[model samples]
Target: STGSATTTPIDSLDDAYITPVQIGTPAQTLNLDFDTGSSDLWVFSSETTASEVXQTIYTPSKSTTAKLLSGATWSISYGDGSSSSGDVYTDTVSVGGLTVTGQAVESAKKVSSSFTEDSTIDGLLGLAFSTLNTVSPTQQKTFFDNAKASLDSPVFTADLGYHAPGTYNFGFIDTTAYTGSITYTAVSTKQGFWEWTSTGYAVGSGTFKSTSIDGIADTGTTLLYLPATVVSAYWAQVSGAKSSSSVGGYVFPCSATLPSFTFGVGSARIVIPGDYIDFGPISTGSSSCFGGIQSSAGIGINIFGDVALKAAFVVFNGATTPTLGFASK
Candidate 1:
């Protein structure tokens, strides 16, 4: 997933969005596929008719709690070649019972066909620690940037628990709130989406082999897409795992006992669960689709699977250090 965050369903407003640590206030309550890969905040407007599971989009004029900034607009592109354009307005965006007023809000009017048809995601709220924001010329700061001076740790962390709605808290980086500190990875400026160097890659108790594959923990991507060489090496170690009939991706037995991979981020080792190797099934006829594990070919980019990310909380501190940082869940 080198492109924009794939739109995800906003199951509940509470589980949907969070304000930056500085603001200590919520903006619009829209679900976004959060990405530490880039920095931006754009939500689909109710005007979008393409979604299957209908959800509410932001309307500055409609929310009594909001303030509309007249005539501001935004548009942006991604490394994977996807783009979004929309109207920008300042409004009160809220989550976790906190409120941030006059926050920059992007109301997307047009979306790529792939984005419009993506049932898994509704929109994206970028969290990359980069300067590339989709907000208009008048808007220089992201929600996090606006909040930094005020929050306790000057940090906001995301703990994603797949299959179950995750926790998004503001005004604080709750280490105790989550299992632990989000694994920390210094951001890479080399290009594509803001990926970083992985100290090493390993599966199970096997010796860790060094690889060039940059670990991309995007919650926005539905499945994991690894570099061909990396996926091959991984599958070679696991039993019952096979390259999928679908090229560029792999499928393995649900009962497969896969190894737990670890990504050394900062001093912490982000451990991926063994069951993460399985991605359930493809269709009704298929007993198991693709579980936590799979190989995808020609994905055009290499990525660490979402399963790898779910293991820890992630703090996309584009609002923090000079180079963005990604830590555990």
Candidate 2:
């Protein structure tokens, strides 16, 4: 069996993408962030003490299929220092049409301010490997991990659109969703991530730097994070772009004409349009706009986040030795 779902970009800035999911009996539907960088399918729930601000909390107590996992708890932290933790419960979770009975659903008892600030995200549906799940005593499998066996193909595809709704397809690959031939490359599952290396990168229409950049294709992250050289090179092309401490990363004048960025994965290349790089104004009415690409110098890992993802259709093949396929749409 296969599943399909449309993910909505939370804001005009495209800060995050969320997909609708149905959990428990009678189907309590919630919009969840489908994150490939982490493995914890957690939710803002009846137990959350973080003071809900326009968030729809999941009430496991109301679900007839919900069962408490004695003494089991979960805690997860993201790259941004935002975190959440709570008790665990196994419940019927469904994504699109794919259903997983007795799936471990971590109910957030506590959430940080950043998560609390994001009103559109009710929870995170982690698509990363099961090894990264935060459940204690016994780690749990992600929704994708648990449903892999039943899927026709042990794979899922992410087609994130720029400022538009995109689709996440599980099991079967829909050829019509992409154009040209798909380039397949093996990924390193080390560190429990879909880590891969890029062949090189080019700033705008510049020559491709034929160097290898070790990184992960992370759907959870909002921006593309590359080495300082690569990030700096891109920003340098823009007339008024500069690295700012106050704004956190590189920011440029809102009127600056951004250039497209291209990177190679194996022999194939994917281009991120210049329009996607403009992450919008730094502050409300501020002339400075943040760049969608940033330096991963201190972040420990390079990331091909949504900025890069919105340009291509990516396939995460989990069957046997995992491989990722990229195709321009």
Candidate 3:
């Protein structure tokens, strides 16, 4: 049955971190995912044509306060092959009870089929610590940069919690709702990302090994990316896991009783749920790989994503702490 006249726009309200932004004259709200890897903001629009069938597209010309981000351009790609490209601009952005004035936003001049096909994700807002964002060189400051100046404590925190289907929030990472003290590390200005050193790693039921592993907690990313050495050592304990096998990536039996996989960082020990190990199907005939944890090259950028994040309360402060803080979510 058709909904009542009291219905609202699609992107206006969402449960996850992506907040709604009103567009055009009548101001239609659009849901947007807040990312920390790339530095930009994008939304689906109505101006898109059939050839461009932007599933989550937004029309800028409709907004009364939509101001173009002059001379800004962007291009980005994710691990899942999802990509988006366009120009950057500024506009008045409203989320929850807060309104971000002169908000830096991105207009997707070009987008991949993956982006247009994603019905759940209406748009993206990159809150990464980087300066050279997907946008043009001239536009270095991101929406968060401008936002930092306006928020309380001259800081904005993110308290990411997913309770049910399509549940999330953004801005003002409330530390009060969480328990215990927050563990913070210094930020790397060179990379614009808060780098953390993992104290150890473990696979299945085996004990965690104490070692140094450089990593970061990135909200923009969808998975946990580890080094080849760590991956090799991890799967080695999985009885059938062998290096020479044509089958790649971490795969295990769904019904199999697997032990809790844990990562040792500093004095704190982070344990990933057993269910987290059960990944997606690697091939039509093979078992599914883990959700987002993958063995890849480049040892420095170990990205701990939503999976680990959901287990704890992460505090991102540009004011109190130069680096991000992690505690029980």
Candidate 4:
């Protein structure tokens, strides 16, 4: 079996991507944020006591196959401090016809302000390793993990685009989706992320700095974060670029001719166009724009978020030893 799903950038800023997912019998569909950074299939549900912000709640009671996972509860939080917790239920879940019976469906009873701020995202479907799942006394597997056995191939590919709709293919890779051969790299799933190392990076068309960069491919995050040295190197090339203390990131004149950023994956180089770095204005109608690349000094981990991911075709291969494949398109 195989699955294909379309994930769209829901806003001009491309803050996050969401995909439609069908849950339980009778098909109560919800648009969920398919995140590769975490492993917890949680949703706002009828069981929620917290306030709602137009998010569609999953009602397990309406499903004939829904079964309570007694004594099972789940709690999860992201790096940004957004958190959710709830009880667990096993229900039939489907995405792009990739169905899984007796799948763990986390019903969020509570959520933070950040979750409520976005009305489009009903919940998150984690694709990262299930070891990162937050369900206990026993953790649960992710949809991808659960669907692996029946899939035609034990892998999935991501093709996110700039201001464009992206497609995720499970069990197979679309040959026409990328140009050139994919460069493969090793990943450490023990860390509970699609963690990989980059050979180096370069600013604009400058010399490629052959420095080792360890980072995670995080679709859930909006910006690309790197070491302070690398970040400084990027902003250094731009005129009138300044790090705003209050704003917490570098900002430049919206009209500045931004330089492109390039990074190495194995021997292949992936380029993020200058236009992609223009995250947008510092404020509505403001002349100053926020940069898409930021320093990762405080976060303790470098993250290649959508800002970087959208620049290349990425693959998360879960067959046996985890690996990542990137190709230019």
Q: Give the winner by lDDT.
A: 4
Error in Å for residue 191 of model 3: 1.8
* Cα lDDT tens digits for candidate 2, 1-329: 98999999999988999999999998999999999999999999989984544488889889999999999998888889999899999999888899989899999989988888888899999988888988998899889888988999999999999999999999999999999989988898878999888899888878998999989988999999999988888888998998999879999999888999999989999998999999999788999899999999889899999999999999999987999899999
* Span of ten consecutive residues with least summed lDDT in model 3: 1-10
- Give lDDT tens digits, candidate 4, residues 1-329: 99899999979899999999999998999999989999999999998875544498899999998999999998887899999899999999988888989899999988989888889899999998888999999999999989999999999988997998998889999999999899999998768999999999999989998889999999999999999999999999998999999999999999998999999997889999999999999889999999999999999999999999999999989998989999988
TM-score of each: 0.75, 0.97, 0.79, 0.98
Q: Write the per-residue lDDT of candidate 3 for residues 1-329, one digit (tens) a residue.
A: 00001112122211134455554445567766766666667765553435655455666776677777666677777656777777765677665545566776677766678666667667777676656476667655666676565565444444444332322233444546567767765556567665667778887677778887777777655456788887767666566543434554566644454455677646766667655554444555555344335665743478876556655666666663566666654
- What's the ranking of the predictions by lDDT, best on top? 4, 2, 3, 1
lDDT of 2: 0.91
Give, for candidate 4, the lowest lDDT window spanning 10 residues. Answer: 47-56
Query: Which of the two candidates, 1 or 4, achieves a greater TM-score against the reference?
Result: 4
In candidate 2, where is summed lDDT lowest over 10 consecutive residues?
49-58
| Best-first order by TM-score | 4, 2, 3, 1
After superposing candidate 3, which stretches have Cα over 4 Å from the reference? 1-19, 22-26, 46-49, 78-82, 154-176, 204-206, 240-248, 280-292, 298-300
